[PDB]
Amino acid sequence: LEAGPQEFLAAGASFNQVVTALERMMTSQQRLLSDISHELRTPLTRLQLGTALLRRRSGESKELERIETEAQRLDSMINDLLVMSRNQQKNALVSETIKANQLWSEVLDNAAFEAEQMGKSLTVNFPPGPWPLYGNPNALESALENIVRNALRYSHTKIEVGFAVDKDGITITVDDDGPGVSPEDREQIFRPFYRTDEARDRESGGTGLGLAIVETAIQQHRGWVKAEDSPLGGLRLVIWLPLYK
Amino acid sequence: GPQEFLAAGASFNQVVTALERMMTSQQRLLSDISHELRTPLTRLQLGTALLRRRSGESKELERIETEAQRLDSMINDLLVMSRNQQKNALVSETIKANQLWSEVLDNAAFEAEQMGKSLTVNFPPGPWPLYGNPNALESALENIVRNALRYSHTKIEVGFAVDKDGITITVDDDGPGVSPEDREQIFRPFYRTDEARDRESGGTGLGLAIVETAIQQHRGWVKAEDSPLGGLRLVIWLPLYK
Ligand SMILES: Nc1ncnc2c1ncn2[C@@H]1O[C@H](COP(=O)(O)OP(=O)(O)NP(=O)(O)O)[C@@H](O)[C@H]1O
Ligand SMILES: Nc1ncnc2c1ncn2[C@@H]1O[C@H](COP(=O)(O)OP(=O)(O)NP(=O)(O)O)[C@@H](O)[C@H]1O
Ligand SMILES: [Mg+2]
Numbered sequence: 033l034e035a036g037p038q039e040f041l042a043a044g045a046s047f048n049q050v051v052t053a054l055e056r057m058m059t060s061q062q063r064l065l066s067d068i069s070h071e072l073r074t075p076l077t078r079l080q081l082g083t084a085l086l087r088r089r090s091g092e093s094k095e096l097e098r099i100e101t102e103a104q105r106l107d108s109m110i111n112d113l114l115v116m117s118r119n120q121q122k123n124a125l126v127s128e129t130i131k132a133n134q135l136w137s138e139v140l141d142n143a144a145f146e147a148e149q150m151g152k153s154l155t156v157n158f159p160p161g162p163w164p165l166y167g168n169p170n171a172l173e174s175a176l177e178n179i180v181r182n183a184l185r186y187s188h189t190k191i192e193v194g195f196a197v198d199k200d201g202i203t204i205t206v207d208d209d210g211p212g213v214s215p216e217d218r219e220q221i222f223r224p225f226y227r228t229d230e231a232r233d234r235e236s237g238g239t240g241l242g243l244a245i246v247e248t249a250i251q252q253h254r255g256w257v258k259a260e261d262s263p264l265g266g267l268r269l270v271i272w273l274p275l276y277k
Numbered sequence: 278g279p280q281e282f283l284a285a286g287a288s289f290n291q292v293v294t295a296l297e298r299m300m301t302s303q304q305r306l307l308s309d310i311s312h313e314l315r316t317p318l319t320r321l322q323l324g325t326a327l328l329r330r331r332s333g334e335s336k337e338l339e340r341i342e343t344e345a346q347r348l349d350s351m352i353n354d355l356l357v358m359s360r361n362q363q364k365n366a367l368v369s370e371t372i373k374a375n376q377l378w379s380e381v382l383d384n385a386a387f388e389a390e391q392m393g394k395s396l397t398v399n400f401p402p403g404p405w406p407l408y409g410n411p412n413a414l415e416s417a418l419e420n421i422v423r424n425a426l427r428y429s430h431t432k433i434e435v436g437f438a439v440d441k442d443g444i445t446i447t448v449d450d451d452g453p454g455v456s457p458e459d460r461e462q463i464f465r466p467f468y469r470t471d472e473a474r475d476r477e478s479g480g481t482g483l484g485l486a487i488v489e490t491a492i493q494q495h496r497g498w499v500k501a502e503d504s505p506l507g508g509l510r511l512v513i514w515l516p517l518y519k
């Protein structure tokens with residue numbers, strides 16, 4: 033009931049208070065991570081001046097090449113971590129009651145514009161309705177956007193999005209006709225910085241935070257995410273989220 | 278009583294796993310990012326080790342190794358404080374100003390030397406007692422002097438002053454200033470002036486936000502002013518310890 037307490041503040045309090053206290057925790061977690069990310073950049077710049085000065089004095093080396101490319105990996109990862117941190121900030125975390133159609137229509141309309149430009153096709157098999165959800169709108173927008181933007185990239189010609197409602201919740205299914213993901217990699221694709229060796233060769237995306245942002249948002253929103261085989265031949269991503277009443 | 282828990286027409290068992298997954302989601306993300314950052318660093322460190330084996334010790338290699346060691350500690354912090362953020366940031370120890378900021382200043386001189394610029398410490402910190410989080414206060418000065426190294430044209434100056442009440446750190450640069458209007462704005466998170474957004478396309482704007490936060494949490498103050506050197510003056514004031 034106190035000053036800076038857990039969700040175990042849940043003992044007595046309403047569900048609503050319970051999630052705002054979680055957001056209180058989350059906002060500081062996001063501040064910790066963005067603060068550590070920002071600071072990691074400075075020993076890295078100094079380290080990089082060190083490698084530069086060494087290459088000047090004793091020239092190129094197998095060992096120096098390793099140190100330089102590892103330092104470069106770190107730089108990219110820290111950059112995408114701050115790109116995320118920038119975005120997750122910029123909007124206070126406030127869970128509100130929001131209707132599925134309002135929440136995701138803009139995402140889908142913008143995805144259609146992007147697809148049109150790429151020369152690919154986006155089909156919405158069944159659109160979202162005024163289905164009541166409870167959560168942070170920006171996190172859930174981002175959750176769908178990451179999944180459809182990934183699909184616009186890895187698809188060969190077509191993308192498909194499909195909504196389904198029930199007394200218990202909403203089921204969002206995204207499909208692509210591009211290459212899939214081997215069944216083994218389907219569990220790992222949700223890990224931060226996990227890219228398949230096939231996508232690592234492409235070099236047209238971030239360090240691999242997209243699906244990590246997705247898994248986190250959806251679990252925090254009392255739902256689930258799954259990667260499956262798509263009937264279109266590529267990847268199927270299924271989001272399930274509960275209904276609020 | 279008040280609004281109880283509702284996910285769907287689900288079992289208590291499903292309610293508890295949903296609840297566990299919901300609350301531990303951000304912790305797990307942060308510990309997973311820490312593990313993933315650690316592996317290129319461990320590789321980097323084996324590279325430095327293999328180089329020291331082949332061509333021995335060097336001033337340059339020593340720099341690479343100590344900077345790699347700084348990274349290791351911060352990656353460890355992310356992991357350690359991921360789980361418990363209980364009441365935000367709550368650790369503090371007694372530290373002396375000279376110990377706290379000497380490394381920052383020595384490293385700033387190395388960076389300045391590389392940039393072709395000059396750093397002058399008009400008066401250095403002494404054994405002046407402070408009480409707070411050392412990393413926050415290190416970072417607080419480092420951000421201000423690293424800012425001064427970037428935006429200065431040729432010179433940077435750092436000056437310490439002590440009194441019965443507190444410590445006053447003054448940082449100056451001969452580069453462009455900041456219009457009086459933007460001087461309040463510059464401390465906001467992810468904010469950069471339109472002048473810096475031209476010089477460098479976009480970029481982070483967390484530096485002075487980390488500064489304002491750390492100094493306020495440590496019961497002090499920060500100020501942006503006109504510098505006698507023609508650029509920007511940043512003044513940190515922090516209280517002394519009982
Ligand atoms: N539709 C898809 N088709 C094929 N592979 C995919 C698809 N979506 C995701 N993946 C794989 O899953 C990995 C992790 O997804 P993700 O987190 O979005 O990384 P990313 O898209 O490459 N980069 P980023 O999202 O910008 O950080 C990718 O690197 C791919 O290997
Ligand atoms: N010493 C300085 N001289 C001139 N302008 C400055 C100085 N320090 C900060 N500024 C301005 O204030 C803005 C915000 O400061 P800051 O938070 O440190 O961001 P940043 O230096 O651009 N990036 P970063 O510190 O790496 O996150 C900068 O983008 C500059 O426009
Ligand atoms: Mg992605």
Ligand SMILES: [Mg+2]
Pocket residue numbers: 420421423424484485
């Ligand atoms: Mg800065």
